[PDB]
Design a binder for this molecule. Sequence first.
Ligand SMILES: Cc1cc(OCc2nnc(SC3CCCC3)n2-c2cccnc2)ccc1-c1ccc(S(C)(=O)=O)cc1
Ligand SMILES: Cc1cc(OCc2nnc(SC3CCCC3)n2-c2cccnc2)ccc1-c1ccc(S(C)(=O)=O)cc1
Ligand SMILES: Nc1ncnc2c1ncn2[C@@H]1O[C@H](COP(=O)(O)OP(=O)(O)O)[C@@H](O)[C@H]1O
Lengths: 125, 576, 192
Amino acid sequence: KSRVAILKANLRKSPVAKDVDLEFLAKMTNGFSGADLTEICQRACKLAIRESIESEIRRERERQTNPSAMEVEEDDPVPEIRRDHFEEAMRFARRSVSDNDIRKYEMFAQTLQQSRGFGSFRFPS
Amino acid sequence: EVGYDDIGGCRKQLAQIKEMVELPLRHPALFKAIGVKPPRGILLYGPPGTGKTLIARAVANETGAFFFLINGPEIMSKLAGESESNLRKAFEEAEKNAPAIIFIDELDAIAPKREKTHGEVERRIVSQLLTLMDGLKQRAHVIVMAATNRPNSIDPALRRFGRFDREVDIGIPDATGRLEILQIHTKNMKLADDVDLEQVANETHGHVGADLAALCSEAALQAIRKKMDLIDLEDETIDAEVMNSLAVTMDDFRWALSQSNPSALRETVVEVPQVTWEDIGGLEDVKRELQELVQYPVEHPDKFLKFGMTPSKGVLFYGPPGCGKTLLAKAIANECQANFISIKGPELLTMWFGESEANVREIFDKARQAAPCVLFFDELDSIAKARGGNIGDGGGAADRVINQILTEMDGMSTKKNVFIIGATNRPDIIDPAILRPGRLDQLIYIPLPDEKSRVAILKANLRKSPVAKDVDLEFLAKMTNGFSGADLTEICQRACKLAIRESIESEIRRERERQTNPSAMEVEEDDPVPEIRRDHFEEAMRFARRSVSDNDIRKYEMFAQTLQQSRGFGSFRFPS
Amino acid sequence: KARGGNIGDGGGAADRVINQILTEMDGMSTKKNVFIIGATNRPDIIDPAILRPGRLDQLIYIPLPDEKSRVAILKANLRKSPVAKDVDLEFLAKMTNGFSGADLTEICQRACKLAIRESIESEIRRERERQTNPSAMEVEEDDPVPEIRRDHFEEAMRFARRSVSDNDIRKYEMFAQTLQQSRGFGSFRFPS
Ligand SMILES: Cc1cc(OCc2nnc(SC3CCCC3)n2-c2cccnc2)ccc1-c1ccc(S(C)(=O)=O)cc1
Ligand SMILES: Cc1cc(OCc2nnc(SC3CCCC3)n2-c2cccnc2)ccc1-c1ccc(S(C)(=O)=O)cc1
Ligand SMILES: Nc1ncnc2c1ncn2[C@@H]1O[C@H](COP(=O)(O)OP(=O)(O)O)[C@@H](O)[C@H]1O
């Protein structure tokens, strides 16, 4: 749930198509940190931007050769981050936090734990 | 009388003996007009109780040769100075009934001298037996077959040319042969319909033909004790119909198997593995490479000979633990239908601690005899780990056991059939000499199973267990991002354990109800949990764990790219 | 431990005896009846091969006895000895915050020893008393200490000690959480 919330927060500004199931992406990210999810979202946005710039440019380059040649239709080749962009991003998905240093954090949390044997403590009735 | 039907086990050395002995015996007149030397002596060796004497008797009966049995201790028990007369008379009598077969059971008693050769009279017996055996004037067709537990137990001069020039290792029967032995030993007891002899055969690993007969007899005796004793109606001869009314049930066989104590479980097993490529879900590049290296030289030896290329006879699997290297080796052996010998790490460690590396010579000889074979050295890095790995001993990577293995491999390749497969979870510490040409040079990396591979592994682990169709396996495999084969097996085992505990607890409570509140009409609702459900798998996965950390996978990736094909030839083009 | 534990020998954890045990276990399971149980106070130094599947894989952690467990241990140790009903055992078990089973056994043994010494000394003096001053009528009052009393247990507990320090319990807790079932699957649900 925290991963889903982080993904939603990162992608709020970016225009994301409703077809992309963000919950599936969050659940597939087994142990990604918030930084890793932000990196994946940034990579997806970068992929979308590169595709949009290349497609619009290559269309304009061909169109500019003949003056007024093709129709004046106002096409948006990529108007939202698509699913393929999210697969493109996940291909480079990385686990920043190794399980050994998570082991160390849980170790320090255990050492900070309130010892043992006082759970059943009860005042005499 | 006894024949090939009586000889069970289908161990495929009886066929070799047949091919050996028909023409010398089945067509004796043929050798009279053709100048050829037949097999003067055949040494059948193997664990006791494997039917060597039975095999010899069956061959003698099926070929018509006069069978003569010279019991080892029968002559040895005779008085000194007249036992030699017994041996000489036995050979003369066998000579008279040409063609004849002389079987020397327990040959390791008449000529046990391994150059130690204690005593005086036994030296006379061994020398006179040598004179007789070498004294066969190639006239008539007497074939001398002898039985011995191991080839090295008998006097070496008996192993020399013309005395016993060819040896056959009958060996322990396998599951298929154990089943056939059970069938032959269970043919007049009117076996019950419930008992199939297949489950017993699979659970009968470690038994020999004598062990199988003893287990069958024990099951029959349990059946006789359970019934027909309560009635206590007995006479001089039990009625045939009354005794036939009983049927040996599966429970009796199960108890007998529990009370078996097989007479040589420790003996090494030479068996065609039953594992198949289906058990491993993937490794297509690895599967094809293994198929090439092993299968191609034999399936198409002519094409290998045409290009003048000698195929590599060694492959070293490296990868994280639990990924299926042993299973892959078994599968490759199964595809080629070649015998599989597995030398696990404990055996190597025992040879190293005991400073007894001559066992490597014995292991290689055994692999050579059972050709085609896939000699697999599982977890070959065990000795290096035992000596260290980070600092280790002051010396280098060389050790006694690996050196002996290298010597045997260098002296190998002559056989053209034995194929060495090595598996190691620590490629960094493995001795470099192991990877030199002529050794296990073809390094194959086994990576963690993929999603599809994980699905296949889960299916293979859960094939026997009753799994409800509701529980989706593809979802579980995909969910496990980096679980190893061992981890998936642990998850499946834990799910099965949870299901078993729940079923036991539930039926136990349900039985209390019947006992606490006796119902007027008995109507069992069957099993409350007949198959493994989604909740069992969810609880089991709750405890799922990744045994293999990503750092050790990183080290394996390093070594893999430590076998890097350069970085400047990728575009090599010939000048044209 | 004999080979070390902190630095040890230059070689790894493998040794002759453990290797033979592993070989026998690998060649075992055929019997279907023998069950191998292993106990170790130093799980960190145990050979990892011992824990591989087909070996002693099921690791079970035995923690220090709880208050109820401590009461049961005290009762078992004192079942044979004559213990006066006055001495409350639940209070003693609860008082022992972290005593091990061995520590409780030592406390019980010390209390019994104190009672035995007191009884011996007392009856010995009482015998002097008849020998020194022969009484006209013999009337033995029986045993001056027939059962273990509160004072004996208080004196014994005065010497009670905790054999097991909290640092070694911390190491065992570390290993226990070193067999940690991950941290991402706790909510695994099938798709439905
Ligand atoms: C023709 C040939 C066959 C061979 O052996 C084939 C073989 N048979 N059973 C087996 S074993 C069994 C199979 C499954 C499990 C193991 N093999 C075998 C050989 C190598 C690797 N794997 C198997 C060797 C070497 C040669 C040759 C190559 C070049 C030349 S020239 C002078 O340059 O023109 C002369 C000779
Ligand atoms: C049925 C079975 C019983 C067994 O053995 C039971 C047993 N008897 N005495 C003992 S020992 C004694 C008990 C107290 C002290 C020790 N045991 C035993 C076995 C294991 C662990 N603890 C005890 C093994 C294995 C199996 C089977 C499981 C699956 C399949 S299939 C092809 O997948 O359908 C085939 C066979
Ligand atoms: N494959 C088999 N088929 C039928 N009987 C067998 C088989 N294997 C072993 N036996 C039993 O083994 C018994 C004695 O073993 P034997 O043939 O003398 O071998 P060995 O001399 O090595 O001990 C025989 O009485 C026979 O019943």
